[PDB]
């Protein structure tokens, strides 16, 4: 029982997911990597208007869930590996 959110890569593609309630930036990066064809180290998520750069947490915050909820929307950007 988790929440559902939308995704859209700068390349011009989009896909929905079932992001978990306690899904941190890491758990989120793993979701997009599934719905799309980009690794967690090449997917830059964005939310809010204008689109922000949901940076990765650190020691202590890594456990914290993403800033998105059931019914939210985000945008990914294929980084340069």
From Swiss-Prot:
Regarding tissue, the record states: Widely expressed.
Subcellular location(s): the record lists:
Nucleus; Cytoplasm; Endoplasmic reticulum; Golgi apparatus, Golgi stack
Q: Which cysteines are joined by disulfide bonds?
A: none
Parts forming coiled coils? none
Subunit comment: Binds VCP and the ternary complex containing STX5A, NSFL1C and VCP.
Q: What does this protein do?
A: Deubiquitinating enzyme involved in DNA repair and reassembly of the Golgi apparatus and the endoplasmic reticulum following mitosis. Necessary for VCP-mediated reassembly of Golgi stacks after mitosis. Plays a role in VCP-mediated formation of transitional endoplasmic reticulum (tER). Mediates dissociation of the ternary complex containing STX5A, NSFL1C and VCP.
This protein's name: Deubiquitinating protein VCPIP1
Q: Which organism is it from?
A: Rattus norvegicus (Rat)
Part of the whole protein covered: 772 to 852 of 1221
């Amino acid at each position: 029982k988790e929440k559902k959110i939308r995704i859209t890569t700068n390349d011009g593609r989009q896909s929905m997911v079932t992001l978990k309630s306690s899904t941190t930036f890491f758990e989120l990066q793993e979701s997009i990597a599934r719905e799309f064809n980009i690794p967690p180290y090449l997917q830059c998520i964005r939310y809010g208007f204008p689109p922000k750069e949901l940076m990765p947490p650190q020691a202590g915050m890594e456990k914290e869930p993403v800033p998105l909820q059931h019914g939210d929307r985000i945008t990914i950007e294929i980084l340069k590996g």
